């Protein structure tokens, strides 16, 4: 139709205008600004603890706010709450559906979430006074599988779906507060800002969107990737975020600049990133890979400053303690090591 | 205060026993993924006192690209086939050549065996229209034609079988094999065929662990 063609041309014109504005914004580049900083050197980290007890492949992992307890999700239908310091399992939650692709630890330490191909986000009450751990709520409004779920507060949760939609739930009533539509492919990862007002969402359309939780509406769309975005992670100050993809690149975007700054890629890496995380100071950018390794990039100068090795299969989850003392990597070999 | 430290060890040793108990249940059961050309369906059946666990992801989207990686430890993938044939062939290409499914075997199930008998007889939609090579395909004579069907149907079925086997035994270089089969709308012995194929799959996997085959 004439209206559709005219509207598509109008959209193309605004895309060109946005591209021109971003190009005029990029007076300099981060590579040529950070040449007068001493390199971090060589970072050697060793497996302090190896945590065994999973039968199937570990598909998700989340640290606690106290940097002591971390939860793990496995395809055999288990949620194990470990104690990193003593290598002692504290809980073993059996899941209704064995296919779980996500797990979230509440900041208060009272609830843990899980979800997968069952299309359902289930919250587990760990405190469970006068009883054992049981399902507290069964959030079911998603047509597609859950890829990532994160806790804003102890009462409300944000989840991603394979039906091209992010959701903000109210656990007390078990209902959708806002729906985050606007993507075109499967949403695969979320990252909440240090202030729980904004969150980014990677997807399979090679685009990362900036969402406002209260307003329920996009603010920026970041497109600099060639393939699906698998991992996403905010900078500690909340003014930037790294983005891993399946094209062997993990770029860094800015919110104020509204464009990419630095691409972290090497010619010897032909695999895909499955996990992206930042150090406490933001200088080190840890990244997972399908080559059974984990590289320690330097966020300011895009050079490799360390390799973490020791996984038989691909790393599928990576996390850094809020204390910033240790980094945990989980792989498909049913193992979960802690590096420090 | 060592009381907390000993209580933690006691809880650890209590849930480790439960994990050991659940390990046997996890290992003694065999998972299968059933797909063709509330949100997930689970079917449990046992034949000859061995437990199976069949799955049917029919409440999701058509982008079977991110959640197909979850089914890599599954012992076998049941591929049911009813231009839907070309779509099935490309789907089998993608499943076979996926770098995470290189060690997962596929058990084909070519249905509509009785439906094609009338379709070829009518001639309204000739198979040669979609597959020009069918005009020069001859049965390899190592077949088992059921008395009652013309050679046209027993050639057509083996044509699709040969297409799937051409996909299968050509690339991949992985620890996996394909098991073609023919079914109908009245038989109930397909569970036995799945049981035998799974027996073969774990047999070959064990033999390759011993590095005999």
């Amino acid at each position: 139709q004439s209206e559709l063609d005219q509207l598509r041309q109008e959209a193309e014109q605004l895309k060109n205008q946005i591209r021109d504005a971003r190009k005029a914004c990029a007076d300099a580049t981060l590579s040529q600004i950070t040449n007068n900083i001493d390199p971090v050197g060589r970072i050697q980290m060793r497996t302090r603890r190896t945590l065994r007890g999973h039968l199937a492949k570990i598909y998700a992992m989340h640290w606690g706010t106290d940097s002591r307890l971390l939860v793990s999700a496995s395809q055999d239908g288990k949620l194990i709450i470990w104690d990193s310091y003593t290598t002692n399992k504290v809980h073993a939650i059996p899941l209704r559906s064995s296919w779980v692709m996500t797990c979230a630890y509440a900041p208060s330490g009272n609830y843990v979430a899980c979800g997968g191909l069952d299309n359902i986000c289930s919250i587990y009450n760990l405190k469970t006074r006068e009883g054992n751990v049981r399902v507290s709520r069964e959030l079911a409004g998603h047509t597609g599988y859950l890829s990532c779920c994160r806790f804003l507060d102890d009462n409300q949760i944000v989840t991603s779906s394979g039906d091209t939609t992010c959701a903000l739930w109210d656990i007390e009533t078990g209902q959708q507060t806002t729906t985050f539509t606007g993507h075109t492919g499967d949403v695969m990862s979320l990252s909440l800002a240090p202030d729980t007002r904004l969150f980014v969402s990677g997807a399979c359309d090679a685009s990362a969107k900036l969402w406002d939780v209260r307003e329920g509406m996009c603010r920026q769309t970041f497109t600099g990737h060639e393939s699906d975005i698998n991992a996403i992670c905010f900078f500690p100050n909340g003014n930037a975020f790294a983005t891993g993809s399946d094209d062997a690149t993990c770029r860094l975007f800015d919110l104020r600049a509204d464009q990419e700054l630095m691409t972290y890629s090497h010619d010897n890496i032909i695999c895909g990133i499955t996990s992206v995380s930042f150090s406490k100071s933001g200088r080190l950018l840890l990244a997972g890979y399908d080559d059974f390794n984990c590289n320690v990039w330097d966020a300011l100068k895009a050079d490799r400053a360390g390799v973490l090795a020791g996984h038989d299969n691909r790393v599928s989850c990576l996390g850094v303690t809020d204390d910033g003392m240790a980094v945990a990597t989980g792989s498909w070999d049913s193992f979960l090591k802690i590096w420090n | 205060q060592r009381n907390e430290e000993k209580a933690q060890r006691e809880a650890n040793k209590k849930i480790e026993k439960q994990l050991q108990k659940d390990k046997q249940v996890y290992r003694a059961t065999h998972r299968l993924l059933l797909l063709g050309a509330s949100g997930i369906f689970e079917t449990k059946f046992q034949v000859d006192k061995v437990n199976f666990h069949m799955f049917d992801v029919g409440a999701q989207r058509d982008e079977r690209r991110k959640w197909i990686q979850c089914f890599n430890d599954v012992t076998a993938i049941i591929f049911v086939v009813a231009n839907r044939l070309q779509a099935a062939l490309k789907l089998f290409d993608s499943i076979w050549n996926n770098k995470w499914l290189r060690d997962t075997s596929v058990i084909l199930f070519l249905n509509k065996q009785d439906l094609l008998a009338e379709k070829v007889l009518a001639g309204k939609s000739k198979i040669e229209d979609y597959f020009p090579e069918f005009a020069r395909y001859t049965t390899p004579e190592d077949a088992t034609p059921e008395p009652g069907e013309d050679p046209r149907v027993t050639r057509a079925k083996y044509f699709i079988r040969d297409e799937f086997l051409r996909i299968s035994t050509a690339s991949g270089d992985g620890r996996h094999y394909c098991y073609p089969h023919f079914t109908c709308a009245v038989d109930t012995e397909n569970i036995r065929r799945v049981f035998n194929d799974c027996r073969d799959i774990i047999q070959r996997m064990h033999l390759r662990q011993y590095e005999l085959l």
Partner: nanobody
Amino acid sequence: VQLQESGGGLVQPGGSLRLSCAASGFTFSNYKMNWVRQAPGKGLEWVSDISQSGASISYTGSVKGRFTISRDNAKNTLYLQMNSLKPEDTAVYYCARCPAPFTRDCFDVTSTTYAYRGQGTQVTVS
């Protein structure tokens, strides 16, 4: 990732037509490409494909011997040449790209949901 297609139009039966796709955003030499089509009142059908270096090419039988595919890595463009068209070969032709680099598998015929696909061009035979 942008894939702009052109070269379509109304063609008399038994004629010829050459569709071209302009690719911008990705390293064209690392991704296996595809050509898909959608006949009116039907679903998306796979027509052809090509490998990273153009070594491996496959067709969908009904187009075998009449259609040929070719890719130019330097110019980041991909062509599909159509010879002896028939009225049955009328559809909107899309130029889908396989999801990931250095991969032999391609899940790129999704029901109007694939992100890495072009807007498509109309090719009519009458």
